[PDB]
Amino acid sequence: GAMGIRNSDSVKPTQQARPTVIRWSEGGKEVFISGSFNNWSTKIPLIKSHNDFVAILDLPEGEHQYKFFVDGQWVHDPSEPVVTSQLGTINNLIHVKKSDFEVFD
């Protein structure tokens, strides 16, 4: 028998960057996040929290667009900064900053 985990299979070769700010609260079975930060070629797992679902990924300083995927379908929150993509597909909006100037050093 065995429990827990030993080593990881994923990797983070990308450069340094701050975490993303995501918070989804509905009550589905599985929640995933995807945006331009990954070319929408992969679904990032949302760390299920006692409070709600959330996502964490080191993204570059700038503005990116992501989308939620719950209940086996791509959904979005009306409270969040959503926008109708060129393909008529509604997507969320995220804005990341840098900590190079925020620090006094």
- Name which of 53, 85, 48, 79 is nearest 66 in CA terms: 85
Structure-block tokens of residue 68: 């939620």
φ and ψ of 36, to 5 deg: -75, -20
Question: For the chain, which residues make up each domain, given as ranges?
Answer: 1-105
Q: How far is CA 16 from the centre of its chain?
A: 16
**Burial per residue of 8-26, b for 16 or more beta-carbon CB atoms within 10 angstroms, e otherwise:** eeeeeeeeebeebebebee
Q: Which CATH number fits domain 1-105: 3.20.20.140, 2.60.40.10, 3.90.850.10, 3.30.300.30?
A: 2.60.40.10
**Which residues contact residue 54 at a Cβ distance below 8 angstroms, ignoring those fewer than 6 apart?**
22, 23, 24, 46, 47
Structure-block tokens of residue 102: 């925020």
